[PDB]
Amino acid sequence: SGNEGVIINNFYSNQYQNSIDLSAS
Amino acid sequence: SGNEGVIINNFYSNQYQNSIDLSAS
Amino acid sequence: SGNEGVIINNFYSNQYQNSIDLSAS
Amino acid sequence: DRVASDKAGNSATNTQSTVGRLCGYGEAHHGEHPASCADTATDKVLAAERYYTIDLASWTTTQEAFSHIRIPLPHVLAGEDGGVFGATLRRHYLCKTGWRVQVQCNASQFHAGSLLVFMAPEFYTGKGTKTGDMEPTDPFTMDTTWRAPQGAPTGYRYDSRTGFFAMNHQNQWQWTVYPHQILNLRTNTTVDLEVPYVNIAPTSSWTQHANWTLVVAVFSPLQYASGSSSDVQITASIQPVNPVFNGLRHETVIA
Amino acid sequence: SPIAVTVREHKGCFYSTNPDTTVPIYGKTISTPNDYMCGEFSDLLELCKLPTFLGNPNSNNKRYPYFSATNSVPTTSLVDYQVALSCSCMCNSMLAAVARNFNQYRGSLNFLFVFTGAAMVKGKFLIAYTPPGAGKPTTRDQAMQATYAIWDLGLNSSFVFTAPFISPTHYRQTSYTSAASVDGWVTVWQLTPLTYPSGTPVNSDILTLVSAGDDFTLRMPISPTKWVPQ
Amino acid sequence: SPIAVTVREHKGCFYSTNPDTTVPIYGKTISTPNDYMCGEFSDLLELCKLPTFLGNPNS
Amino acid sequence: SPIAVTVREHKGCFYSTNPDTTVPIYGKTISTPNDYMCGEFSDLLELCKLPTFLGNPNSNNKRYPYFSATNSVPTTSLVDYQVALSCSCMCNSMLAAVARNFNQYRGSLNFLFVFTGAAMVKGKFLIAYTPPGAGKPTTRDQAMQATYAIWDLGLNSSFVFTAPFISPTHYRQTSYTSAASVDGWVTVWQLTPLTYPSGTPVNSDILTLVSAGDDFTLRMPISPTKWVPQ
Amino acid sequence: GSDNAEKGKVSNDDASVDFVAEPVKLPENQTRVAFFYDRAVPIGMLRPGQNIESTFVYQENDLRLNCLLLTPLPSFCPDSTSGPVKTKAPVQWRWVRSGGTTNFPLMTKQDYAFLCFSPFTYYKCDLEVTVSALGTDTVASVLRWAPTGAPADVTDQLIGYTPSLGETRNPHMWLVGAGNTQISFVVPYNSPLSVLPAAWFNGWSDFGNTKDFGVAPNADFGRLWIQGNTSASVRIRYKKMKVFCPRPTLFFPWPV
């Protein structure tokens, strides 16, 4: 969706690379 | 468990990267 | 056996990385 | 169900106001032999596995919040009062054990006050600074007089200077984090505790380390109207849980 | 052949919190076996639930593990804790000691009260929690309008009072860093006077401890403003 | 063994619009839940279709 | 396209013990065949089990591969080895020579005694191991209270005595680096006097060797304080 | 609501218990011993007493040493009735101490964070060490490490014009050249002990029980010696940390 176009795009785990989305309810 | 979030996280063998856990008994 | 603990440990072919062991007889 | 009895060899404690037995770290000394010693251990000595009942202290209206007394282990039972247990302990390099304790103290429905009775690992038992060496005095001896709290619990330095703090610091405001029970004059005359074996090593060079300490501390000051029985003691029944001995030798002269 | 690489602008940089490991220089070393050990734990959060003592200030301004009550109904409150980890009467509780190493919290705080007066003594207290918006309560009557519970003395010595987590935001900052100062107050009042017979100490002491409740959590590990013990 | 690499001429260079991410220093941090929210949108283009006022000049 | 890389802070750094290999500059080179060879070994530990000589000091203070006994029961001990790799009478045994290149040890030490007095000679010795805590033994009687074994002379010339590995910790430091100095003592005493007939050398010599026992291990390879042979 | 603290514990409630309310709990992991201590923190710094071409020698200067002890606990040149003996390797101290008149800096080295907050009696882990340059000059430096209890081998240069510290089979590091400025690495729990004392060791360190009470022997991760032209900030990081038997944290001053 955003301005990111790299295939090997993992290296750092997802949960580290980004804030964790979680729904209150 | 700890503060480590890298996928390709091996390179150095486990036994070299960390003290070896072993139970006396 | 020796002091080497790296997984991806090939890059250079074996025969180049080490003297070639061969038995006279 | 507030009435209970506990037997150990030829000894037996008994109480009519118990509030249960608090078992530290949720587990007990099983008497396993130490993987660090090659020699077959001496263990299961009935004569040594009982309650040794002794005097702790006299509680008075004078003592204030957090005043306390420290009892070191096994040390306090390493001599005469330890009977066969102390006698066997004195002849071995290493000992590994747990503790089961009952602290006793009664008053009346017209008396007020409360005690914090607990057990802590590696708790400072030093009495004072030894003039000359820059070390403590009588680490392994039980307090014979109530100890005043530190307004600022920063511990004790031996270099005769002050500032910052020492590693032997003990912050009483948090003492309830240790395995414990509260002895409240209006509720109960006894507390029952138990702890496993813990330490920096598989078994212990007891001769030079008091790994566990039994601490009795005041929470709310003793109080009573004139005419009410003024004399109040605190005693205790201490029992070694599954003591295991290694490295038999000529006797260490505690004496 | 060599692999071509694009060297990122941030090179040679060191990260105190880098999510990755570094080079091992003494491999194959066995870690001295410690299977005998007991008392082990994994979550700092647990330490938080162990009730520890609140520091109550005296006129000459020195602290006690408790507060006192007697045969009277003090027009004002007996004690009042400000629901706020940063808050000072907690300065020295395990709860606060752990909390100051984290940026935010969520959930219930549990206030534990223990009556140490004589068995022959009786009476009732009114413990309350007041959320912000209308200012802190100045009378039992007002307090009684917020969240409250009546504590009756008797056979059972103690009482666990829960300060509910009522808030606009899913989380709350753990520290008084700038000034919205608080998240409401916990106030303790006499409902009925401590009553008793002749021959009984007229002034009873109530131990006051605090701890994190069940719901409770902390997050974002950080450093507190450095300090020096007295 | 180490992997041999050819270091490109453009090294150490920073790209304002670089199509890639960088190093994470505060991982495992949950993003304060906002499931209650309404009024959300994804495309600036929509704003474009909302009719707004033309500014007509007077003498 | 080139792969983007993050260059770690520790770059260009060299590691004496780096767990990895480096660049090969003379590849495909055959290693001169040595299939004919015998006597090969893989573990330094084995060298440790080969019994070698203990250096026993004389009054004029010079060393012997042994000690002497005779038709008497010396009130004090005949010899006394301090169970401690660092220890000096072992200074020159293979056991110690290997051990000084490692930081810690575990397991049994085996002390080997060989009687070289005349066939016509008899007698008995009391070899003992005393753990710390009560100080080192000063009399056969005391020694006899610790771990011990009686050695009887006869047809069979020698005796293997095992100093048991009795310790608080799973491992023990191999070196006198600062001061807890030791792990107990091995003491040798006469139980009964060396007895014999006229025409026989009255003073018999007992060879004293030491070695690592079966249980025994070493770990953490290191460097000893450098030295110079006399 | 109603309970009894005497028995050693009490109901650990949430709002829903005493009132018409409920549990507001959300998932969350950042409060874990392991994760939490798994971040870098400075304990001291290293200052070279000598060149990369000479024989190394213990050296102090304005509280700075050319050698340091790997432990969270406080350390420094050994103390003495007559003052700390600065011609020697640092050892574990029993208290923290001001470098001089005012509180700071400190004469002693240590993990102040870990001290102000170690809610436990014993711990263990591996140690990740980072050595960062404090200066801007092309660097030429050698670093030597050794496990707790090992010989310092602080002997003379065997080969002239080269660093004595580099002359060992022990793990040593060689850093030199423009842009080459930081050293990073990890060492194993290398202690003879099963677990380490987070704060205090209620016993004597010698069989004669006359010395160093409160300090457990070999209760550290070894040490560092430096040599060359560059001073460096030294930080440690708790790897795969484990803690035992909970205990009280460092006291905090009550507001005047």
Side-chain angles (χ1 to χ4, degrees), chain D residues 138-156:
Chain D
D138 302 333
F140 304 154
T141 221
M142 123 164 71
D143 288 313
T144 59
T145 75
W146 296 94
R147 268 186 81 101
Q150 298 188 139
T154 55
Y156 311 84

mmCIF file of all heavy atoms in Angstrom, chain D residues 138-156:
data_model
loop_
_atom_site.group_PDB
_atom_site.id
_atom_site.type_symbol
_atom_site.label_atom_id
_atom_site.label_comp_id
_atom_site.label_asym_id
_atom_site.label_seq_id
_atom_site.Cartn_x
_atom_site.Cartn_y
_atom_site.Cartn_z
ATOM 1 N N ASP D 138 30.491 -10.770 63.142
ATOM 2 C CA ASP D 138 29.453 -11.836 63.465
ATOM 3 C C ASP D 138 28.296 -12.098 62.451
ATOM 4 O O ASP D 138 27.169 -12.260 62.914
ATOM 5 C CB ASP D 138 28.762 -11.526 64.795
ATOM 6 C CG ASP D 138 29.820 -11.451 65.890
ATOM 7 O OD1 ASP D 138 30.924 -12.131 65.719
ATOM 8 O OD2 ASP D 138 29.659 -10.727 66.912
ATOM 9 N N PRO D 139 28.716 -12.091 61.263
ATOM 10 C CA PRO D 139 27.655 -12.404 60.193
ATOM 11 C C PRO D 139 26.675 -13.611 60.510
ATOM 12 O O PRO D 139 25.527 -13.538 60.393
ATOM 13 C CB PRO D 139 28.500 -12.812 59.005
ATOM 14 C CG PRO D 139 29.987 -12.724 59.392
ATOM 15 C CD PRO D 139 30.118 -12.293 60.827
ATOM 16 N N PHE D 140 27.456 -14.617 60.919
ATOM 17 C CA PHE D 140 26.703 -15.905 61.281
ATOM 18 C C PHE D 140 26.059 -16.219 62.652
ATOM 19 O O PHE D 140 25.756 -17.338 62.944
ATOM 20 C CB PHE D 140 27.612 -17.089 61.077
ATOM 21 C CG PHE D 140 28.110 -17.054 59.624
ATOM 22 C CD1 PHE D 140 29.307 -17.634 59.267
ATOM 23 C CD2 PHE D 140 27.331 -16.361 58.670
ATOM 24 C CE1 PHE D 140 29.753 -17.561 57.940
ATOM 25 C CE2 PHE D 140 27.777 -16.288 57.345
ATOM 26 C CZ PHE D 140 28.988 -16.888 56.980
ATOM 27 N N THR D 141 25.932 -15.159 63.296
ATOM 28 C CA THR D 141 25.268 -15.199 64.679
ATOM 29 C C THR D 141 23.841 -14.532 64.707
ATOM 30 O O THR D 141 23.689 -13.559 63.933
ATOM 31 C CB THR D 141 26.129 -14.338 65.616
ATOM 32 O OG1 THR D 141 26.255 -14.940 66.874
ATOM 33 C CG2 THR D 141 25.594 -12.927 65.797
ATOM 34 N N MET D 142 23.005 -15.113 65.438
ATOM 35 C CA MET D 142 21.623 -14.512 65.500
ATOM 36 C C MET D 142 21.524 -13.192 66.340
ATOM 37 O O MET D 142 22.164 -13.138 67.391
ATOM 38 C CB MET D 142 20.629 -15.480 66.116
ATOM 39 C CG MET D 142 19.916 -14.892 67.336
ATOM 40 S SD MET D 142 18.457 -15.810 67.777
ATOM 41 C CE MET D 142 18.919 -17.387 68.463
ATOM 42 N N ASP D 143 20.795 -12.300 65.774
ATOM 43 C CA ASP D 143 20.601 -11.006 66.560
ATOM 44 C C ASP D 143 20.070 -11.239 68.042
ATOM 45 O O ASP D 143 19.057 -11.933 68.166
ATOM 46 C CB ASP D 143 19.589 -10.077 65.899
ATOM 47 C CG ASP D 143 20.125 -9.432 64.623
ATOM 48 O OD1 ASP D 143 21.305 -8.909 64.609
ATOM 49 O OD2 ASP D 143 19.398 -9.412 63.559
ATOM 50 N N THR D 144 20.807 -10.728 68.918
ATOM 51 C CA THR D 144 20.378 -10.868 70.390
ATOM 52 C C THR D 144 19.585 -9.638 70.983
ATOM 53 O O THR D 144 19.213 -9.636 72.118
ATOM 54 C CB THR D 144 21.579 -11.035 71.304
ATOM 55 O OG1 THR D 144 22.437 -9.909 71.182
ATOM 56 C CG2 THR D 144 22.406 -12.277 70.976
ATOM 57 N N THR D 145 19.457 -8.745 70.101
ATOM 58 C CA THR D 145 18.632 -7.498 70.401
ATOM 59 C C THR D 145 17.957 -6.871 69.113
ATOM 60 O O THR D 145 18.611 -6.963 68.065
ATOM 61 C CB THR D 145 19.440 -6.366 71.012
ATOM 62 O OG1 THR D 145 20.247 -5.738 70.029
ATOM 63 C CG2 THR D 145 20.361 -6.815 72.144
ATOM 64 N N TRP D 146 16.780 -6.450 69.335
ATOM 65 C CA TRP D 146 16.093 -5.866 68.133
ATOM 66 C C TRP D 146 16.949 -4.860 67.296
ATOM 67 O O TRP D 146 17.676 -4.080 67.907
ATOM 68 C CB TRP D 146 14.822 -5.162 68.473
ATOM 69 C CG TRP D 146 13.798 -6.119 69.032
ATOM 70 C CD1 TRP D 146 13.563 -6.389 70.320
ATOM 71 C CD2 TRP D 146 12.884 -6.846 68.243
ATOM 72 N NE1 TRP D 146 12.475 -7.320 70.350
ATOM 73 C CE2 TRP D 146 12.092 -7.573 69.119
ATOM 74 C CE3 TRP D 146 12.666 -6.955 66.866
ATOM 75 C CZ2 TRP D 146 11.067 -8.421 68.690
ATOM 76 C CZ3 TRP D 146 11.633 -7.815 66.444
ATOM 77 C CH2 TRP D 146 10.871 -8.513 67.314
ATOM 78 N N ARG D 147 16.795 -5.036 66.068
ATOM 79 C CA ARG D 147 17.534 -4.089 65.145
ATOM 80 C C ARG D 147 16.688 -2.913 64.541
ATOM 81 O O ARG D 147 15.654 -3.205 63.965
ATOM 82 C CB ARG D 147 18.182 -4.849 64.016
ATOM 83 C CG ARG D 147 19.616 -5.229 64.393
ATOM 84 C CD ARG D 147 20.379 -5.872 63.258
ATOM 85 N NE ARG D 147 20.941 -4.915 62.294
ATOM 86 C CZ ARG D 147 22.232 -4.534 62.288
ATOM 87 N NH1 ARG D 147 23.095 -4.991 63.205
ATOM 88 N NH2 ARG D 147 22.755 -3.679 61.397
ATOM 89 N N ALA D 148 17.198 -1.789 64.845
ATOM 90 C CA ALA D 148 16.465 -0.578 64.274
ATOM 91 C C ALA D 148 16.490 -0.439 62.691
ATOM 92 O O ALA D 148 17.566 -0.718 62.144
ATOM 93 C CB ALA D 148 17.051 0.729 64.791
ATOM 94 N N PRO D 149 15.376 -0.138 62.227
ATOM 95 C CA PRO D 149 15.339 0.065 60.706
ATOM 96 C C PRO D 149 16.202 1.272 60.144
ATOM 97 O O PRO D 149 16.380 2.187 61.022
ATOM 98 C CB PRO D 149 13.882 0.404 60.452
ATOM 99 C CG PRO D 149 13.126 0.390 61.794
ATOM 100 C CD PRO D 149 14.078 0.073 62.913
ATOM 101 N N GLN D 150 16.554 1.189 59.008
ATOM 102 C CA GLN D 150 17.219 2.426 58.409
ATOM 103 C C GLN D 150 16.148 3.417 57.745
ATOM 104 O O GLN D 150 15.385 2.891 56.918
ATOM 105 C CB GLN D 150 18.185 2.072 57.307
ATOM 106 C CG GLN D 150 19.344 1.195 57.762
ATOM 107 C CD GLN D 150 20.391 1.015 56.662
ATOM 108 O OE1 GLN D 150 21.582 1.055 56.937
ATOM 109 N NE2 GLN D 150 20.000 0.829 55.412
ATOM 110 N N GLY D 151 16.152 4.583 58.239
ATOM 111 C CA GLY D 151 15.153 5.590 57.620
ATOM 112 C C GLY D 151 15.282 5.569 56.033
ATOM 113 O O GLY D 151 14.324 5.546 55.334
ATOM 114 N N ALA D 152 16.510 5.539 55.722
ATOM 115 C CA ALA D 152 16.910 5.337 54.247
ATOM 116 C C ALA D 152 17.772 4.001 54.050
ATOM 117 O O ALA D 152 18.963 4.073 54.258
ATOM 118 C CB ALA D 152 17.770 6.452 53.729
ATOM 119 N N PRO D 153 16.983 2.984 53.892
ATOM 120 C CA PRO D 153 17.717 1.642 53.799
ATOM 121 C C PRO D 153 18.852 1.483 52.710
ATOM 122 O O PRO D 153 18.588 0.761 51.747
ATOM 123 C CB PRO D 153 16.618 0.660 53.473
ATOM 124 C CG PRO D 153 15.293 1.431 53.349
ATOM 125 C CD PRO D 153 15.527 2.897 53.587
ATOM 126 N N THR D 154 19.859 2.197 52.942
ATOM 127 C CA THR D 154 21.007 2.116 51.935
ATOM 128 C C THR D 154 22.166 1.091 52.245
ATOM 129 O O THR D 154 23.146 1.072 51.545
ATOM 130 C CB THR D 154 21.707 3.466 51.788
ATOM 131 O OG1 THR D 154 22.136 3.926 53.062
ATOM 132 C CG2 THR D 154 20.798 4.545 51.197
ATOM 133 N N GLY D 155 21.889 0.358 53.278
ATOM 134 C CA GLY D 155 22.896 -0.691 53.702
ATOM 135 C C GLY D 155 24.108 -0.192 54.578
ATOM 136 O O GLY D 155 24.049 0.897 55.116
ATOM 137 N N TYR D 156 25.063 -1.052 54.623
ATOM 138 C CA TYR D 156 26.281 -0.745 55.429
ATOM 139 C C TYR D 156 27.687 -0.858 54.738
ATOM 140 O O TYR D 156 28.077 -1.967 54.394
ATOM 141 C CB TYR D 156 26.254 -1.626 56.687
ATOM 142 C CG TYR D 156 24.895 -1.549 57.385
ATOM 143 C CD1 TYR D 156 23.832 -2.357 56.957
ATOM 144 C CD2 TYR D 156 24.706 -0.663 58.454
ATOM 145 C CE1 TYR D 156 22.584 -2.273 57.591
ATOM 146 C CE2 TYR D 156 23.456 -0.580 59.090
ATOM 147 C CZ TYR D 156 22.396 -1.385 58.656
ATOM 148 O OH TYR D 156 21.183 -1.302 59.269
#
